[PDB]
């Protein structure tokens, strides 16, 4: 037993699992998906605890699917704004405002790899994601494995 606010405040693999077996539903339920910037934040916090381990991997993927399905399912949610802000927060696209610099890009990249394969994901966004993931960037270079996997996946979308 743990709460979404505490998890989002200080994400950790353990905290995610402490949310319970319905953690995926809870993350999405407690997130204001009407706001693109907030969906980006939730997505990055969740993906930041990704680990190539059974329980954690499943928990992150399910959480991402629940959150992003809810966001994209609203005919009002601007998917392009989500993508733009996501890239900004990942340090792949410049912006007018100042945003925190994300350290590890491994989690975000692996979460995207899973997301782009789901039915809820608008295919129109794949080309843009690919253009910015293939674009030269130091942060992406340090996480070549995840980067290569995501691109290989984007090629099949």
């Amino acid at each position: 037993p743990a709460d979404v606010s505490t998890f989002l405040a200080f994400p950790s693999p353990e905290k995610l699992l402490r949310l319970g077996p319905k953690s995926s539903v809870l993350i999405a339920q407690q997130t204001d998906t009407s706001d693109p910037e907030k969906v980006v934040s939730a997505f990055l916090k969740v993906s930041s605890v990704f680990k190539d381990e059974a329980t954690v991997r499943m928990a992150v993927q399910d959480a991402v699917d629940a959150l992003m399905q809810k966001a994209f399912n609203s005919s009002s949610f601007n998917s392009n704004t989500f993508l733009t802000r996501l890239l900004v927060h990942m340090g792949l696209l410049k912006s007018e405002d100042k945003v925190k610099a994300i350290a590890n890009l491994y989690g975000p990249l692996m979460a995207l790899n899973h997301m782009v394969q789901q039915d809820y994901f608008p295919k129109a966004l794949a080309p843009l994601l690919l253009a910015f993931v293939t674009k030269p960037n130091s942060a992406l270079e340090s996480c070549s494995f995840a980067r290569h996997s995501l691109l290989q996946t984007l090629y099949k979308v």
Binding site: L93, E96, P127
Partner: protein, 157 residues
């Protein structure tokens, strides 16, 4: 305390009216009381002949801060334009428009506008401000050029 900025802007206005590139527009907006608002200028940049931007007249606003010219003016296309270096908000950036880069007192409004005009046909692919135009530019130049021509016609006087 913008007296210093106003003294310079007043001279820049006279200099521009005395001589400026043909087709270009740069005029201060008016305050509700009819007086000039030198901190907010309405500009227009003509597409360069021989390029797919020809025939178009692209409007943008130049906003100056109270500490001008210590800081560069903020330039934004209105409405936002389809271009790799034009943000969704319409904001356009250049090295000479960045305080921590090439901005300096020696920079003129004429220089900025000509600089932005050059940028229109020669995008900076290393530092895009928009994901949509950047993506098409890199994935299908022919299609990109087509979108540009249609936009050039739509914004013809």
């Amino acid at each position: 305390m913008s007296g210093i900025a106003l003294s310079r802007l007043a001279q820049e206005r006279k200099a521009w009216r005395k001589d400026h590139p043909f087709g270009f527009v740069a005029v201060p907006t008016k305050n509700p009381d009819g007086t000039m608002n030198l901190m907010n200028w309405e500009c227009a940049i003509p597409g360069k002949k021989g390029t797919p931007w020809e025939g178009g007249l692209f409007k943008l606003r130049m906003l100056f801060k109270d500490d001008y010219p210590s800081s560069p003016p903020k330039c934004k296309f209105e409405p936002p334009l389809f271009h790799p270096n034009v943000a969704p908000s319409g904001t356009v950036c250049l090295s000479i428009l960045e305080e921590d880069k090439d901005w300096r007192p020696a920079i003129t409004i004429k220089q900025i506008l000509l600089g932005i005009q050059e940028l229109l046909n020669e995008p900076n692919i290393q530092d895009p401000a928009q994901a949509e135009a950047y993506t098409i530019y890199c994935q299908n130049r022919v299609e990109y050029e087509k979108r540009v021509r249609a936009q050039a016609k739509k914004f013809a006087p």
